[PDB]
Amino acid sequence: CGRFFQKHQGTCFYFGELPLSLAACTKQWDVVTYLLENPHQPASLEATDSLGNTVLHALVMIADNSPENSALVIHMYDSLLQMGARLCPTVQLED
Amino acid sequence: CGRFFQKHQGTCFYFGELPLSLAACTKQWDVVTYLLENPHQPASLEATDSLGNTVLHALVMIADNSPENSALVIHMYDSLLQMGARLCPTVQLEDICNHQGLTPLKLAAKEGKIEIFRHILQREFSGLYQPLSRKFTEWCYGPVRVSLYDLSSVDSWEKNSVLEIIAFHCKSPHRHRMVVLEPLNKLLQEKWDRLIPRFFFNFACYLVYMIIFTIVAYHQPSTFGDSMLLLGHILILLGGIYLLLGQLWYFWRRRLFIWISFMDSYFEILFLVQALLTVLSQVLRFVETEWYLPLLVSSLVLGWLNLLYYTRGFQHTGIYSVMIQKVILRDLLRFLLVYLVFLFGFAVALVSLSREARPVPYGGILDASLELFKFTIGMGELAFQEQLRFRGVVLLLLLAYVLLTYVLLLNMLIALMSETVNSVATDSWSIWKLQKAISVLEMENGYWWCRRKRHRAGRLLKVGTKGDGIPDERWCFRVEEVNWAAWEKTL
Amino acid sequence: QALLTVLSQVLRFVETEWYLPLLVSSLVLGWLNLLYYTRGFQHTGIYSVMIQKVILRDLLRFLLVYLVFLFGFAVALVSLSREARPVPYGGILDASLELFKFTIGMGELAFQEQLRFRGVVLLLLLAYVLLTYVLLLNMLIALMSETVNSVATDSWSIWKLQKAIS
Ligand SMILES: NCCOB(c1ccccc1)c1ccccc1
Ligand SMILES: NCCOB(c1ccccc1)c1ccccc1
């Protein structure tokens, strides 16, 4: 939680300030898997950032109207939702 | 160096009058190689022609806007630059001033070449040949990219720059499209945002001067009030002479601008005329003549019309002013030509008649012309003159005139202006950007009396390492851009 | 409109001479507001949206240029015609009204034989009518034609949004 990552006016890049969010928003479908299913310390998928955003929220914010960005965000969103449902069905991340 | 090769009008082909230039411009990547690497007598790559052009200059001149020609010139230019760097790195061929004193970038800008000019403006290479690069990329952390374009010989700080050459020296039909490209757009936008205060201060000062002029001209001759009138008069005279000095200094400094495009600005002439009228009106009032009021009122009108020059400094109004100018120059003078022909013909026709009876309307040419213009303005007096013996002839002539003018000409003019407005939509934005760029360049230079100190924008950011020892420095213009098409291909 | 109505009633209770202006202004504003309700139809809401879009897009630039030209020419004419050889162009209000008459379709373009600057006044009037009655108004017609052509589907979308808000 610094200044570059914060969503503001100027030089910035917002990704939810979380390693899993950084991987997902970066189109990195491999390290996200390892972080999810690393036996040493699996990363909780419902952990939030300072502003209250979650991984899905972070995926939403960086979304734009560019066809390529829209496709990337759609694919990552769907895949992450399916995976999260497969890990901990008891919690609805959409809410 | 004869007649066919020399760049002129007629049967001609220019290739720099050098065998290597002929080979390169001819798309012959083989004999150029042999000439460069022939052991018996290698051909120097920095040898010039009579005009001072070099091989790169020759490649630039023959460049056109055709996609195939642009691609050919781009490929040959890049390959030859790489080869020259590989042969004699100690000499930078990109910096070779010909007789006129221009480099390939400056020459490409002046000659109107856009494709090759833009390609030279923003080009990048791999790790090898990296120094031969204008565009760079510091890091690509995430989807953002931080580009750093070189600002050597393109910034306004230099005595001669690409911005100045495009603004005041280029005479291409659509040079206004050369100021919308990458940091010639962003750089100009930054300069404009930094210089807004100067522009609006100038606008406010001019408005104050015009308001004083109006007040003096309203409560003018036909104690305290007399002293106020006198001080207003002296202030107006001082303002007029100061405007005259400024405009004369501008013309003296840019005296090689009018022949390129008189109508590009066409506003400095108006300011000069207004100042001349004001000063001359004051002098003739000193002479106590009856022609003081006409000149003074004409100056007042011209100033209040000139204020549009300042009001076109906004996105929403500059485009409207540009459209006004384009319509005026495109389709309003043909309409006037046809209108005056018809009006003079019908006016003299009506004057010839109505001169034989069985307050005389159509007594002269002025009266008939005024009546016809009243027809055109919406107050046509179309009656049945029962006094003159040619009632029917006069009535039919008036009906024919109104049918030919009030139905065809004016409504057709409406339609033609609709078409013209539809045609010029994006060109309006480009021309507005060019006008704003010219205003920025003029403001950057100080007034005719105060020598404004130059502000050399850009960051002295060390880029890469040249093929030498101690490293190099180069001023650049940082530009951040969020891109995913390029970022998705870096993985 | 509600503020004007209530305040007009209060000032009438005060027995002032400014009751009629405020009351009539309220009446006019209400009759104009009725368009809010009339734009509840497919065929009329789009027209109202187009009216608003044209007003906001290209009618204020025209007014800016118009008022600049009109004030300049009005004060110019008032300065003249003040020296002879019912005085037209007596003040600024009269000259402005005469120019607006030119623009509305009842321009009084005559040869004033009384003032000593006949030709100057006539040429100024001719220049004004040429610059305003030919360029500005017909150009405004063309610009509104372009604007109407531009906003066709956006008009439907904005009408749908307005109906959703209602
Ligand atoms: N001469 C006053 C300013 O020029 B304008 C004009 C009027 C007189 C002569 C030629 C042109 C005009 C053109 C564009 C914007 C505003 C008006
Ligand atoms: N003020 C009356 C209603 O607004 B309208 C209008 C009139 C006065 C001030 C500004 C706008 C108008 C715009 C669209 C539809 C109908 C008329």
Side-chain angles (χ1 to χ4, degrees), chain C residues 29 32-33 35 48 51-52 55:
Chain C
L29 210 58
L32 298 184
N33 282 344
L35 278 294
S48 183
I51 286 167
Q52 189 254 324
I55 288 169

Side-chain angles (χ1 to χ4, degrees), chain C residues 21-39:
Chain C
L22 293 200
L23 191 86
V24 75
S25 296
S26 173
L27 196 148
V28 161
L29 210 58
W31 278 115
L32 298 184
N33 282 344
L34 196 66
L35 278 294
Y36 167 89
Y37 283 113
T38 198
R39 58 79 171 159

Side-chain angles (χ1 to χ4, degrees), chain B residues 193-241:
Chain B
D193 285 331
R194 182 67 165 86
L195 265 186
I196 285 172
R198 178 64 32 74
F199 196 69
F200 275 42
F201 173 87
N202 285 1
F203 156 85
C205 190
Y206 188 75
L207 193 58
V208 169
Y209 157 87
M210 273 308 298
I211 281 169
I212 300 317
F213 190 12
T214 299
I215 291 299
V216 162
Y218 196 97
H219 317 289
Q220 87 293 16
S222 199
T223 72
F224 161 86
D226 283 28
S227 178
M228 291 281 259
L229 192 173
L230 294 177
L231 67 83
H233 170 232
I234 198 65
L235 260 60
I236 297 169
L237 182 43
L238 287 198
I241 189 64

Side-chain angles (χ1 to χ4, degrees), chain C residues 149-159:
Chain C
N149 210 311
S150 292
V151 301
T153 61
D154 291 331
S155 48
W156 191 76
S157 171
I158 296 176
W159 171 58

